[PDB]
Design an enzyme around this catalytic site. Structure first.
Site, short mmCIF file in Angstrom:
data_model
loop_
_atom_site.label_atom_id
_atom_site.label_comp_id
_atom_site.label_asym_id
_atom_site.label_seq_id
_atom_site.Cartn_x
_atom_site.Cartn_y
_atom_site.Cartn_z
N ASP A 25 -6.21 25.72 -1.50
CA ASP A 25 -6.24 24.52 -1.57
C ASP A 25 -5.59 23.51 -0.75
O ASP A 25 -4.39 23.17 -0.76
CB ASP A 25 -5.70 24.11 -3.29
CG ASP A 25 -6.16 22.94 -3.76
OD1 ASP A 25 -6.46 22.10 -2.91
OD2 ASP A 25 -5.71 22.62 -4.69
N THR A 26 -6.36 22.84 0.21
CA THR A 26 -5.69 21.88 1.34
C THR A 26 -5.28 20.82 0.69
O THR A 26 -4.45 20.19 1.10
CB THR A 26 -6.63 21.65 2.22
OG1 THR A 26 -7.84 21.08 1.63
CG2 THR A 26 -7.03 22.90 3.11
N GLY A 27 -5.56 20.17 -0.77
CA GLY A 27 -5.29 19.15 -1.30
C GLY A 27 -3.91 19.39 -2.08
O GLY A 27 -3.58 18.30 -2.70
C1 LIG Z 1 -5.61 16.28 -7.12
C2 LIG Z 1 -5.00 16.61 -6.11
C3 LIG Z 1 -4.27 15.65 -5.18
C4 LIG Z 1 -3.74 17.54 -6.26
N1 LIG Z 1 -4.23 18.89 -6.90
C5 LIG Z 1 -4.87 19.81 -6.06
C6 LIG Z 1 -6.41 19.76 -6.17
O1 LIG Z 1 -7.23 20.49 -5.15
C7 LIG Z 1 -6.80 20.22 -7.71
C8 LIG Z 1 -6.69 21.74 -7.85
C9 LIG Z 1 -7.38 22.07 -9.16
C10 LIG Z 1 -8.50 22.97 -9.61
C11 LIG Z 1 -8.72 23.33 -10.63
C12 LIG Z 1 -8.28 22.85 -11.75
C13 LIG Z 1 -7.14 22.18 -11.61
C14 LIG Z 1 -6.47 21.78 -10.27
N2 LIG Z 1 -8.34 19.89 -7.84
C15 LIG Z 1 -8.81 19.13 -8.48
O2 LIG Z 1 -8.10 18.47 -9.54
O3 LIG Z 1 -10.18 19.01 -8.57
C16 LIG Z 1 -10.80 18.11 -9.47
C17 LIG Z 1 -12.04 17.43 -8.62
O4 LIG Z 1 -13.00 18.54 -8.61
C18 LIG Z 1 -13.20 19.65 -9.72
O5 LIG Z 1 -12.95 20.71 -9.33
C19 LIG Z 1 -11.66 21.32 -9.50
C20 LIG Z 1 -10.90 20.48 -10.62
C21 LIG Z 1 -11.64 19.10 -10.25
S1 LIG Z 1 -3.25 19.37 -8.06
O6 LIG Z 1 -3.73 20.66 -8.70
O7 LIG Z 1 -3.17 18.18 -9.26
C22 LIG Z 1 -1.70 19.66 -7.52
C23 LIG Z 1 -1.33 20.91 -6.83
C24 LIG Z 1 -0.06 21.07 -6.21
C25 LIG Z 1 0.69 20.25 -6.10
C26 LIG Z 1 0.63 18.89 -6.74
C27 LIG Z 1 -0.79 18.71 -7.42
O8 LIG Z 1 1.65 18.09 -6.67
C28 LIG Z 1 2.38 18.47 -5.80
O9 LIG Z 1 1.85 19.96 -5.42
#
Ligand SMILES: CC(C)CN(C[C@@H](O)[C@H](Cc1ccccc1)NC(=O)O[C@H]1CO[C@H]2OCC[C@H]21)S(=O)(=O)c1ccc2c(c1)OCO2
Ligand SMILES: [Cl-]
Ligand SMILES: [Cl-]
Ligand code: NA
EC number: 3.4.23.16
Lengths: 99, 99
Positions: A25-27
């Site tokens: 997860d690059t985000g």
């Molecule tokens: C929102 C971004 C800025 C940060 N997130 C990482 C994401 O990649 C997250 C990773 C993620 C994936 C699945 C469930 C929860 C989190 N994806 C996500 O929320 O995607 C949403 C949009 O598309 C949908 O598909 C996935 C969920 C929806 S995170 O999971 O909240 C997160 C991870 C590590 C962290 C953090 C926050 O703060 C500090 O370190």
């Protein structure tokens, strides 16, 4: 390897003696794993995303094997809906985004 | 380009003739952007992240430039903490993960 993004980029990891599936997860700044025990000390942290914040335990100097590559770093443990390998460990295995 | 992950993979996007900053996020299925006006009708969607679920507005077939690459696809609008470019548009710009 080269991983396309048609599907979620899931890999097998080994952490604390346990095999798990996790999302590359690059985000994510940080690596966040579902509730499990890890050795050593920890401290509380709050991390926020879509939906708001969760409380996690921060463990430092944890070794993880990610798709066959060893890395060490901080791992957060708490009620994440998915195991996430974040940039702190992606950098260590040499991961890049290419287009 | 080849983007390393020591820093957040932030790029410039252009949507509605406006430049914005967004995060290239391989952990996101969908693209989610902060409140803005988009043309056409929208449909409801719930998305779940680290902290829980949120309601967003789903707009289809939106023209969006990402790091100088043209994409046309679905954009979700709502209270995301950062603009996130998800896999639905990363595949359109040819992005892969490599290590
Ligand atoms: C929102 C971004 C800025 C940060 N997130 C990482 C994401 O990649 C997250 C990773 C993620 C994936 C699945 C469930 C929860 C989190 N994806 C996500 O929320 O995607 C949403 C949009 O598309 C949908 O598909 C996935 C969920 C929806 S995170 O999971 O909240 C997160 C991870 C590590 C962290 C953090 C926050 O703060 C500090 O370190
Ligand atoms: Cl670290
Ligand atoms: Cl490097
Ligand atoms: Na430790």
């Amino acid at each position: 390897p080269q991983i396309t993004l048609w599907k979620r980029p899931l890999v097998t990891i080994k952490i604390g003696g346990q095999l798990k599936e996790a999302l590359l997860d690059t985000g994510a700044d940080d690596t966040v794993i579902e509730e499990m025990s890890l050795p050593g000390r920890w401290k509380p942290k709050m991390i926020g995303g879509v939906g708001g914040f969760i409380k996690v335990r921060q463990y430092d100097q944890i070794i993880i094997e990610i798709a066959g590559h060893k890395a060490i770093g901080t791992v957060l443990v708490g009620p994440t809906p998915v195991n996430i390998i974040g940039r702190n460990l992606l950098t260590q295995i040499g991961a890049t985004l290419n287009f």
